[PDB]
Amino acid sequence: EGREDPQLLVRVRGGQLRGIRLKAPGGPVSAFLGIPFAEPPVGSRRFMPPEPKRPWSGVLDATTFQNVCYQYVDTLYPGFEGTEMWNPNRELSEDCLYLNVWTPYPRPASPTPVLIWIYGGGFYSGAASLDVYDGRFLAQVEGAVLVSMNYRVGTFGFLALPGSREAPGNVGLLDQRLALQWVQENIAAFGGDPMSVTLFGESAGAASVGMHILSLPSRSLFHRAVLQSGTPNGPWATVSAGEARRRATLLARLVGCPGNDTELIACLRTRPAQDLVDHEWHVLPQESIFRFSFVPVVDGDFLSDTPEALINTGDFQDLQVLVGVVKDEGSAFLVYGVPGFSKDNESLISRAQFLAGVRIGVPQASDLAAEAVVLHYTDWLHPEDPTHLRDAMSAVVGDHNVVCPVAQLAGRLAAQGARVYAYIFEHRASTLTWPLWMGVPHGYEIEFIFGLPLDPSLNYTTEERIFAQRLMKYWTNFARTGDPNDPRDSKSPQWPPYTTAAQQYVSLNLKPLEVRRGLRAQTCAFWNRFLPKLLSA
Amino acid sequence: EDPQLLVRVRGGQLRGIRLKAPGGPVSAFLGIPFAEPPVGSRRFMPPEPKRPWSGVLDATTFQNVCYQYVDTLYPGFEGTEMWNPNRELSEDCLYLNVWTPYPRPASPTPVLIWIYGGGFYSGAASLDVYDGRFLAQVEGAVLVSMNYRVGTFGFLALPGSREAPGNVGLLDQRLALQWVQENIAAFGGDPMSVTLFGESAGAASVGMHILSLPSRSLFHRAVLQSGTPNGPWATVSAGEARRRATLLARLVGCPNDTELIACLRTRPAQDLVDHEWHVLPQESIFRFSFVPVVDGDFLSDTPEALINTGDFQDLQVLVGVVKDEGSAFLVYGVPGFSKDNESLISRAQFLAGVRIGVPQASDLAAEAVVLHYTDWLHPEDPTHLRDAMSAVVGDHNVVCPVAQLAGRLAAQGARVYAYIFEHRASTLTWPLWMGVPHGYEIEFIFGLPLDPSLNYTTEERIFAQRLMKYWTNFARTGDPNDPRDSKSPQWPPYTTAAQQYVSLNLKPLEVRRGLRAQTCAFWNRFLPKLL
Numbered sequence A: 001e002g003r004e005d006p007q008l009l010v011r012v013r014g015g016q017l018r019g020i021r022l023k024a025p026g027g028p029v030s031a032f033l034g035i036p037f038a039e040p041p042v043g044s045r046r047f048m049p050p051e052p053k054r055p056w057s058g059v060l061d062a063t064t065f066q067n068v069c070y071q072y073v074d075t076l077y078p079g080f081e082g083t084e085m086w087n088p089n090r091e092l093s094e095d096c097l098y099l100n101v102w103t104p105y106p107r108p109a110s111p112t113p114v115l116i117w118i119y120g121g122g123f124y125s126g127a128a129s130l131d132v133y134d135g136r137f138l139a140q141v142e143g144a145v146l147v148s149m150n151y152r153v154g155t156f157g158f159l160a161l162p163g164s165r166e167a168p169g170n171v172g173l174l175d176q177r178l179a180l181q182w183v184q185e186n187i188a189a190f191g192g193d194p195m196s197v198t199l200f201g202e203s204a205g206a207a208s209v210g211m212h213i214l215s216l217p218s219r220s221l222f223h224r225a226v227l228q229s230g231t232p233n234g235p236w237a238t239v240s241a242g243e244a245r246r247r248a249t250l251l252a253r254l255v256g257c258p259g260n261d262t263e264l265i266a267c268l269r270t271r272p273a274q275d276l277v278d279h280e281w282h283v284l285p286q287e288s289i290f291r292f293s294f295v296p297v298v299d300g301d302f303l304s305d306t307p308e309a310l311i312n313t314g315d316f317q318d319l320q321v322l323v324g325v326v327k328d329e330g331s332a333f334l335v336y337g338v339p340g341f342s343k344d345n346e347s348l349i350s351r352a353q354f355l356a357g358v359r360i361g362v363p364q365a366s367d368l369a370a371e372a373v374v375l376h377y378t379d380w381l382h383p384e385d386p387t388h389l390r391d392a393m394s395a396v397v398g399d400h401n402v403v404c405p406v407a408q409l410a411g412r413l414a415a416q417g418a419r420v421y422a423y424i425f426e427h428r429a430s431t432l433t434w435p436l437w438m439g440v441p442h443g444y445e446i447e448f449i450f451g452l453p454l455d456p457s458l459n460y461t462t463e464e465r466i467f468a469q470r471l472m473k474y475w476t477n478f479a480r481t482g483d484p485n486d487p488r489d490s491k492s493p494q495w496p497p498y499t500t501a502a503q504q505y506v507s508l509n510l511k512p513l514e515v516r517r518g519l520r521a522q523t524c525a526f527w528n529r530f531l532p533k534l535l536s537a
Numbered sequence B: 001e002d003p004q005l006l007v008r009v010r011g012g013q014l015r016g017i018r019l020k021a022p023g024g025p026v027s028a029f030l031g032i033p034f035a036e037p038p039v040g041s042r043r044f045m046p047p048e049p050k051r052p053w054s055g056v057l058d059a060t061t062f063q064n065v066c067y068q069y070v071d072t073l074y075p076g077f078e079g080t081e082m083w084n085p086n087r088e089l090s091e092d093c094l095y096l097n098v099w100t101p102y103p104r105p106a107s108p109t110p111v112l113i114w115i116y117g118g119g120f121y122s123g124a125a126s127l128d129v130y131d132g133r134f135l136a137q138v139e140g141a142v143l144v145s146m147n148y149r150v151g152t153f154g155f156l157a158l159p160g161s162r163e164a165p166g167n168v169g170l171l172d173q174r175l176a177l178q179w180v181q182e183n184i185a186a187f188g189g190d191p192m193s194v195t196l197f198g199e200s201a202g203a204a205s206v207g208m209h210i211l212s213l214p215s216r217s218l219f220h221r222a223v224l225q226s227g228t229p230n231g232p233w234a235t236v237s238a239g240e241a242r243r244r245a246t247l248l249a250r251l252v253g254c255p256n257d258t259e260l261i262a263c264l265r266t267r268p269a270q271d272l273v274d275h276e277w278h279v280l281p282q283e284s285i286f287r288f289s290f291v292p293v294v295d296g297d298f299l300s301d302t303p304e305a306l307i308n309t310g311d312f313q314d315l316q317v318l319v320g321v322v323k324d325e326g327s328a329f330l331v332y333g334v335p336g337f338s339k340d341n342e343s344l345i346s347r348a349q350f351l352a353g354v355r356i357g358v359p360q361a362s363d364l365a366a367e368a369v370v371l372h373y374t375d376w377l378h379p380e381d382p383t384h385l386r387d388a389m390s391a392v393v394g395d396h397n398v399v400c401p402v403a404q405l406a407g408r409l410a411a412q413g414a415r416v417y418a419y420i421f422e423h424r425a426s427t428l429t430w431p432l433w434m435g436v437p438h439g440y441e442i443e444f445i446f447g448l449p450l451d452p453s454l455n456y457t458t459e460e461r462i463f464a465q466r467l468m469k470y471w472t473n474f475a476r477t478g479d480p481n482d483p484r485d486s487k488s489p490q491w492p493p494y495t496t497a498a499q500q501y502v503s504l505n506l507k508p509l510e511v512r513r514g515l516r517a518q519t520c521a522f523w524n525r526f527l528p529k530l531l
């Protein structure tokens, strides 16, 4: 300990940690990377709820990110930045339950609001160690204390035989909850305020934030929530108990595992990690995009009912939420399975290809429902136009899966006492390597929120760097106060709360805040109010 | 004896009357018999041609109006009285009217034939709004209008029977059409240039002559104003007509087909009219009990099947709608609606209204209509709900059937011109909220604003002149554009890709694209697949 930097030695419940002094553009920050918050969920602990980390002795080195949770690695376009930046940047292992802390350097004098980030990746991938999730900018410029955790994905995190003890389901949400409990117990050691914790997340991260909102034990572990482009309701974020059982049973069958729950899980346990990954996609009921095999399950425990039933009957009075979407939520998903679509051409499609694409984007639709979608999205002045058909296909996937479930969520939370703020994110990064026709794709607001444009060596424009500063300001103000608006700041335009009466939300882009009314309101009535009844009768 | 008012037709000699038009004299020949009176045992039967007469037949007045229900919703109000019979009611009513220039056209003149509307249960060729003198005088047109049988009298069918075969009101129209072929040259008309035009049930009539072979050699061009033979109200199936005829008979104490019609023929006219409205299967508006039947004869198949398979290559058609087709219909049955208040309604009332406006809708289809017409920023605003109700009725019954017809005729070789009429008459007595109601362009097409004693504005007099010019240019050439006027924009043909149509209002022609295209996709393409 003699010669170490005194500002980097911290004790937590399990013992002593040494962090690292990192350079941010404006000055130094403190990082504590790869803190274990759980016993390594390996061997007989696969599929199992996580157990609190046993204390170590000596000084645990927390200067590097730890292993990423075992997952499928995207290889659709090897070498391409657009996909590689989401791929694991550390070795895969089932031994992966670690979290990461960024704080100002020196650590703040007085209790500081805490941001907890939950990554996305369809519940089958992701990592808290990705460059785009780097907490140094928020820690340095805003003084934030930032935490992000690994949680198990795919089979390891969500394979379930509901009702059993050996694979209860939702263990990936349980990992996240453990990390939240860790933050309650330990964040003060870092100068964080456990009495002011904001969750934020994008995609499946956002659906996770959503599920902590809807799960009572989690509710005492945070105060405010930010859902970016993801919701707990909707067609992909959860499965019924029955459907989870079918999928788990089929996967077991496909890897050579024969009847009752104990035998079946013991055999899966047993199989090499890569084996479960190699077969994970084979268990989906239909040809489809935006569907993932192993997701949170409606177990009657972590989720005591469907998310739809819970948002409809909950009282959300003590709650402040920020929710929003990007302009082109669906575009990037199309190249993963809709024929006619590719990142290396303009992807102009015919009416045939559009109808075939709808059956893949809306796998649960009968021929009547699919016709309804195709008719709703047709441009009747130019019904054969391949540019519009291509943008229709993107909007279908984007609206059904993200925009309309978000609009629905905002509407329910507002109606039942929550303070809600809503945005559509509309700026395409000058650095984006996906094609122009993809517009502003899923995930590309992250990036600005974490303030990467502030790095002089990333080649963003000055306007983009200013924009990043604005977004960090809204996000941390929300964390700080429950309100994204700057209280001191006279000259600026105000971001109003979303309400059922006025349906007000804001545009985030290079221009000042513009207030808009109704979030794809006509189309969301189609998806949220009409389409369900069609699929019912 | 004025020689310009003496004409010899095939049935004998006729004498008309010199009328005053603001510009000058016209010749009128009113009450020319074109058929034997369909009385007694000819009730419900095809018309037979009129027997020859002797001496000189006095054709100087409108004859009886065909027996029909008379609207008593608002007694003595102009808005409804102007559509009511203005002559005596009678089963003896098969008379037609002819206006020509004075003196009579020197050279063969294109002929316009007017077929009145009135839901197939009413109307007369004798209403002031159908006055042919203006078109005759200003544009030099030969105009013909005929009475045809309506209600039980024109349309009660026992399909398959000798004695009530159905569609006899259309056969009356056809007989008047053949009569024009045989006689109009005596008036200086050109039997080689005949244009049908009609509004509402009369537009549906025109459309049926387009879809019926024997009619097709009696006219060259057609105008369909605010109605079509396709759509939910213009035809019934053979089975549905038999159901209705049998029910009417039962309601009047009658009694095999022969015995049932025999007893119906013994019933006074008014006893039949009395129970006319009790036979509809559902409480509804924009539905009429006795309309053309798909008999397998006049109509060899449903209008939809016929427009989908027809070759319409030698045909020109003008079609259009007024801006607020459904509004006038709401006060005739929808709870919450009245001409004497602003008719602000609730959401509950909108759905109750949809059940009456779209009577064939299931709960789910009714929900689809309601969801589609809702304004999602103000889902409770009473003004929008009221206007939506009007749009549901207008789109479902008129606008979207018109769009379908236009699309099909153009896809299959017809030259098609389409319009939306958007001028509300300064003289109109319906309330402002009704906008521009069903029927209210006829006024202008006939050129009534050219009458100084009616005091339309000067701008309306000019407007009326433009529309008379369009309509007769079209009758003259199958194209409403003025073949010597070198002025923009030209009214372009409606085609299935560009979907160009024009708005007729006080301002010059504006070309628009897509006739409520999104909404018509809902009615024409989704909603049927739903039921």
Ligand SMILES: C[N+](C)(C)CCCCCCCCCC[N+](C)(C)C
Pocket: A086, A121, A203, A281, A290, A332, A333, A336, A337, A441, A442, A443
């Ligand atoms: C591998 N298969 C074909 C079986 C499934 C791939 C699932 C699609 C992944 C989403 C792509 C969006 C990219 C950007 N992010 C995820 C960051 C928003």
